[PDB]
Amino acid sequence: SKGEELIKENMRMKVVMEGSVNGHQFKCTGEGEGNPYMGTQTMRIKVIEGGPLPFAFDILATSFSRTFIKYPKGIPDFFKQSFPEGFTWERVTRYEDGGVVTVMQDTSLEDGCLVYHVQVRGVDFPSNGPVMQKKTKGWEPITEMMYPADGGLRGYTHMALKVDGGGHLSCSFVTTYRSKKTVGNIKMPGIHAVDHRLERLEESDNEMFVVLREHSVAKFA
Secondary structure, eight states: OOHHHHSOSSEEEEEEEEEEETTEEEEEEEEEEEETTTTEEEEEEEEEESOSOSSOTHHHHTTOOTTSOBOOTTSOOHHHHTTTTOEEEEEEEEETTSOEEEEEEEEEEETTEEEEEEEEEEEOOOTTSTTTTTOEEEEOOEEEEEEEETTEEEEEEEEEEEETTSOEEEEEEEEEEEEOOOSSOOOOOOSEEEEEEEEEESOOTTSSEEEEEEEEEEEOO
16 A cells, blocks of 8 residues: 555654643654664654643653554555555543543654654643652553454553552553545544553653653554
C-alpha cells in the first residue's frame, strides 16, 4: 500500500506538546527515531515552558507514536496505510483517585519525518496525590485492545502507574484513532491486541530532560 512506501525501515519523528495539568501551563518538544516494522522507537524530550513541572512527567509519557507498531502478517496496519495524510487520536484517561486527562494528537508526515502535535488537559488530580506530589516510578507493560469503529480504531487500555513504596494508580484509556485520508482505499483490521513496553532512560534530576523508549507489537485476540 501507498502508506507502507512512505514508512521506511528507519523513520525520524518530532513532537510539540502543549497543555495544562491542574491549571499549570507547560510546553515540551521532542525528537527521536525508530524502526516502524520492529515496533521500536526512542525520543529525547525537553520541557521548554513551565519547567520544572509540579506533577509527574509519567502522566505525559503515554502521549509522546502508533506508526511504530510491529504488525504480524495477517493483521492490517491501520496507522501505516493512513499516510501520506496520517491520522489523529483523541483520548480520555481517568485515574483511580480523581485525575482526568484529555489529549488530542495530530500525526503528519513532512519531508520523510513524522510530526506530532499533542494538546493535553489534565484536571482534578489531588494536590497531595502521587501525581501532584511527583511520587510515581513509571508504567507497568500495557495491552491495548484495538477494535474497528466506523473506518477508525477504538483503543482500550487498563494501565498501572507505580507509586513510591509499591502499590499502583489504576487508570483506563479509551482512544479514538481516525485517518485523515480523503483520497484512497484502506484494508481495515479486525479486533487485535497491541503490547506496549514504555520505559524512561536518562531523566534529569527534575524531569526537564527525559528519554522514552517504546516497544509496540500487535497480536491476535
